[PDB]
């Protein structure tokens, strides 16, 4: 769309100006049930060839149901919250006796509904499959005859269509032990996920966003396994809500900034230890240090606010002017000189130092730029690859406009050797 | 496989932080971060500076507002905790809570003689 950036050469850093946040701020719980009936012994004579697969398939179904019966850089300053919280709370509400009977009775014919519980929680109900009708009309009248024999094999293959889903649920919850990250399409088909998008109490622009990013909400959703009792087997999806949508959110890339002293090891240097995402949420900014938590999709970031900081709104002031008497402007410092390079959305920041080859090269003209010393920058729409030392990188060829500002060697404003070199977290 | 065979004298430091028996390892920094953590039976809020600090539940709205300092809420009085711009949900799993009175330990020392440049330390 309108991706832009401003690599400051004062401190080696990239700001990803222009994005829309679409941040989760809460969970919306929903219960999903599959109805199912208890099957007794086979009550059949012989083994045959037509009526044989029914026996192994019903034994597999029995194994599944009895198995599920048996079933039941600022990360150091980053807060920790139990993400699997509301769903296990809803399961715990379901553990009370006579409560899941309300779901059983109230969701008798309607596919989706909303019921009230004994804790005032009235989230949602939904049934995913109807093994009542199929089991008690198309399987058990046939398999439980005198000297049983199926009419045709076409009966049992659709039984595959009505049992591989349940077996997928069983094998998903058996491996990941109740909690699944993310939610598989077997726990919710995608068209039904869209139906659920059209169900929860959100405003319609959130509905459009979640519809256009069903893969994102599928990736961030969790699943917790609730009870099995009175054979109304059900679980809870803890699919993400989305509180604040469409605010500018920038990605701060950072790079080493080391003076080019020929004497090795005596070149103290520093970076902004502020790599991550900053979204302007409410009268503050949500800061995400762990870049792996945040996801990106076509100008739309998606990052869960449980692992964030409610940092004050005065952060662009330090972002532009590093030397301000308003923000702490946190610093990583060390005398270690490492040749390295990072990739922003619209180019690459090279920070090779000392005896190290530094090249930006593209497949059209071969090599196109050589960096002598100091951190430098290359726009993405002039080059495909960047080589530093003995390693290569490919830049994002996504279209966007770049502007490279003139900066200055900030670390050379101070004395060459008075700096400490023994801290990860610091500030100016 | 990823553990420490730490000596049996660890509850002594766990109750009494100032003891001449254990090292009682310390993280230290001057950085002031509003944050909150969740235990099994409640929430520890540690918001500082100008930051909204609320323990609220869907029954009757908000139920506690925190001025400053770290404070605590039992899980069986509240569903959600809001710090700054983010919300967390507490574990509703049933258990008994007891909140003991403590003291501002860091105010026992001088306000500014502390170092601020170590991740691993001890008392």
């Amino acid at each position, epitope marked *: 769309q309108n991706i832009t950036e401003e690599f400051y050469q004062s401190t080696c850093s990239a700001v990803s100006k222009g994005y829309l946040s679409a941040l989760r701020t809460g969970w919306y719980t929903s219960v999903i049930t599959i109805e199912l009936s208890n099957i007794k012994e086979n009550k059949c004579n012989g083994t045959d060839a037509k009526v044989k697969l029914i026996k192994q398939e019903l034994d597999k179904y029995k194994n599944a149901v009895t198995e599920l019966q048996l079933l039941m850089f600022l990360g150091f300053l980053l807060g920790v919250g139990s993400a699997i919280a509301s769903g296990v709370a809803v399961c715990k509400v379901l553990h009370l006796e006579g409560e899941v009977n309300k779901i059983k009775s109230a969701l008798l014919s309607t596919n989706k509904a909303v019921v009230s519980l004994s804790n005032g929680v009235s989230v949602l109900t939904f049934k995913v499959l109807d093994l009542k009708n199929y089991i008690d009309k198309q399987l058990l009248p046939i398999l439980n005859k005198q000297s049983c024999s199926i009419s045709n094999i076409e009966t049992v293959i659709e039984f595959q269509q009505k049992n591989n889903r349940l077996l997928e649920i069983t094998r998903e919850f058996s491996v990941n032990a109740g909690v699944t990250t993310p939610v598989s399409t077997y726990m919710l088909t995608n068209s039904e996920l869209l139906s659920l998008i059209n169900d929860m*109490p959100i405003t*319609n*622009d959130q509905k459009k966003l979640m519809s256009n990013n069903v893969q994102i909400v599928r990736q961030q959703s969790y699943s917790i396994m609730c009870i099995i009792k009175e054979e109304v087997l059900a679980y809870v999806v803890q699919l993400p*809500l989305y*509180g604040v*949508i*469409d*605010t500018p959110c920038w990605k701060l890339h950072t790079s080493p900034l080391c003076t080019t002293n020929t004497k090795e090891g005596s070149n103290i240097c520093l970076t902004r230890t502020d790599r991550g995402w900053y979204c302007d949420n409410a009268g503050s900014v949500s800061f995400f240090p762990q870049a792996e938590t945040c996801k990106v999709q076509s100008n739309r970031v998606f990052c869960d606010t449980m692992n964030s900081l409610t940092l004050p709104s005065e952060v662009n002031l330090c972002n532009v002017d590093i030397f301000n008497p308003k923000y702490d402007c946190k610093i990583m410092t060390s005398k270690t000189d490492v040749s390295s390079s990072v990739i922003t959305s619209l180019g690459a920041i090279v920070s090779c130092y000392g005896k190290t080859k530094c090249t930006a090269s593209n497949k059209n003209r071969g090599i196109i730029k050589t960096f002598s010393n100091g951190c430098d920058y290359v726009s993405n729409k002039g080059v495909d690859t960047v080589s530093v030392g003995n390693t290569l990188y490919y830049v994002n060829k996504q279209e966007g406009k770049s502007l490279y500002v003139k900066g200055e060697p900030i670390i050379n404003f101070y004395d060459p050797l008075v700096f400490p070199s023994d801290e990860f977290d610091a500030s100016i | 496989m990823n553990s420490l065979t730490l000596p049996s004298e660890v509850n002594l430091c766990n109750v009494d932080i100032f003891n001449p028996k254990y090292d009682c390892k310390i993280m230290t920094s001057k950085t002031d971060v509003s944050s909150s953590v969740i235990t099994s039976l409640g929430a520890i809020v540690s918001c500082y500076g100008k930051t909204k600090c609320t323990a609220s539940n869907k029954n009757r709205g908000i139920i506690k507002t925190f001025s400053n300092g770290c404070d605590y809420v039992s899980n069986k009085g509240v569903d959600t905790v809001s710090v700054g711009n983010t919300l967390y949900y507490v574990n509703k799993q049933e258990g008994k809570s007891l909140y003991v009175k403590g003291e501002p330990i860091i105010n026992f020392y001088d306000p500014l003689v502390f170092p601020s440049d170590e991740f691993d330390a001890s008392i």
Partner: antibody
Amino acid sequence: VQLVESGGGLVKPGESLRLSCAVSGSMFSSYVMHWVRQAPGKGLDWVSSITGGGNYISYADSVKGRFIISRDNGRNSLSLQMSSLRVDDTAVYYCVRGLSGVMGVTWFDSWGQGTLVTVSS
Amino acid sequence: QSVLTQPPSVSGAPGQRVTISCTGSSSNIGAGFDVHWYQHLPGKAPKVIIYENSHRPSGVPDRFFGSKSGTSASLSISGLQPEDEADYYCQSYDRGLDWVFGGGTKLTVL
């Protein structure tokens, strides 16, 4: 946190014209914007919504594309265009700066002064 | 035309407690949406009395008391005061008409 807007007057129905919205807030980049209207007599109802970058527009059933809304965040301003008009659309129009809810919902916090637009005769 | 219904004929002398109720269909409010009471005194801008039925805004007196139940929201005021003359509203996010507003109640003193 205040809000001043203009664009009122007596114009015949059927023609497009500007409605300005000139909030002076510092962090007007994130908060949701709505336009509502209070008719003479009959009470107030919602008209138009716009969300940040303006990629999730929504309108009430009175105007399906008849009122087109756009904000320039760089100029921290907002504008509504009367693509189509009707004689019943006379009302006092209000810009309103809503804050996102605990879920997502607009609270419609401190409003503008409200500009009277008349389209009679 | 409004799906939200509230009686626009409620008034009393200053001093007592008056309760206002606004109700809607099932597709709004009872479908997990919140109600927000406003005021519309003539002259200056309309502002919020209370929002989502429990959070009052910053500067309000404690006379206003909001509550919700199903599709019905209630606002009770004890000790009526002279400048309570206003048109009080209710809103939600019905899945049909997106942002809806009620008829409103004209509160005045005698």
